[PDB]
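Colleagues,

Please find the record for the three-part complex below.
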Amino acid sequence: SINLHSAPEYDPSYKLIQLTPELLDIIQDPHQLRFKSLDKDKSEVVLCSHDKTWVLKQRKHSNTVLLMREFVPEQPITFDETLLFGLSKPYMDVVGFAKTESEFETRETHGELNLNSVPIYNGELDFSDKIMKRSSTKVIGTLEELLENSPCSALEGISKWHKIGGSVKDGVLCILSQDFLFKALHVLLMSAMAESLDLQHLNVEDTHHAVGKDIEDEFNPYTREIIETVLNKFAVQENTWRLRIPFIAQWYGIQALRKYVSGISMPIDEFLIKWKSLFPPFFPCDIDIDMLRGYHFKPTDKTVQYIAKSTLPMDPKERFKVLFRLQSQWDLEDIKPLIEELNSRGMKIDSFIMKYARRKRLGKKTVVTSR
Amino acid sequence: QTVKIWVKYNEGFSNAVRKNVTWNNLW
Amino acid sequence: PSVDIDASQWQKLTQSREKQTTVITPLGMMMLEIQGELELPKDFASLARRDSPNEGRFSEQDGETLIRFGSLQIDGERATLFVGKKQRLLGKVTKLDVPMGIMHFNSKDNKVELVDVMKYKVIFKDRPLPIM
């Protein structure tokens, strides 16, 4: 048997944390895990690896939980045992050093950026104005500082920074406006073809040079930092960058849909032409209406019209109602992105659809229609 | 007259609602 | 603020050691769970003064007075807990659904150490029985 001892005071600096399989593996790797919080008395505490984020929660319970450790007695522990039964001789001693009335639970969470003193850049030069007419006075200068004050991991943060089009100007972190981001892409693309650059292997220096070599600097907002931002948004690097041509085509197509087929429909091949015309000349891409799945519907099979998902009814039977009203027969994957959000009980997505829709075979192909 | 040691049994078990955690709740 | 979890000490001891079964963790720790309150006296110093060597209820370890409150007998997986003179509780050695890290939070430095990782517990859910 084991002799059980207790101290007169427990130490509450000892606490229990759930180690999910992934966290467990890291803890046995062989300082890769980090606790973080915006402040000391207010905000959530998160736990971060290089690559992932967990949130901490605590849950009190009603039982006694003693944490006990083996100890070596200074003197042998002698006492009269008075009964036999079901109790072998002591062979070791343990002492309760902590008593916990709760667990800290660890749950996977989406890392996010803390964007508070960070301005939008639209951006004329003499950005000093927007810098000094801001929220704080304090400047967030570096991405590292931004990350340090964020509820997310290094890699989650960098990835979001690239996806929202983060940049820096005059030593001040900023975020590019949708308009300027798009405009900056357009100018970078124009210039890259004009100088016969390798769009699979771009770098900041050559691309920066290509953009500004015939522009007077004091009127050139496309700094190296801006060029890097645009590459990290619309390209993939590795150390050079590779342009994401389909992503870029879609980006233009969505604008086209908004401009030409917002309240109105248009023949698909005639729309393609107008979509194609927004590109800078000679831009190598073959455009296809299926790149705009989730952003359009087809009132007839040879017409197209724009749709914003956000306008749709929230109840899924209502959503399916409105879509079939707009278009009787849907190719299966045209309609999937417009209804996935409502699939809350994580059904397999094609089961979710057959709950509200019917499959119908025409020629060879399979379409979907209302039940 | 000497030391008396025992478990006062709980008839069952309560797990409370989970709560947020502050930096200070850890230290 | 931010701080890393130091698991350095734990990783070397997990190599200088060997065994789990359950028994105890290799580092020498265990988790005891009881459906109830453990009632110990409010004043150890007073009762320790008065302590027979027949009872053997109090001892000094590293500057602390420890009360000897019970005995634990493992036979399965099955476990029996004797508390004080008059109680027997029947329980179970349970493998944890989710392993539990014991972390020590040193407030002076705002630093945190991995003390051990608990994978088993011994738990007692049922009303205490009379002795034997």
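Residues 1-132 of chain C form one domain.

Comments are welcome before we finalize the supplementary table.
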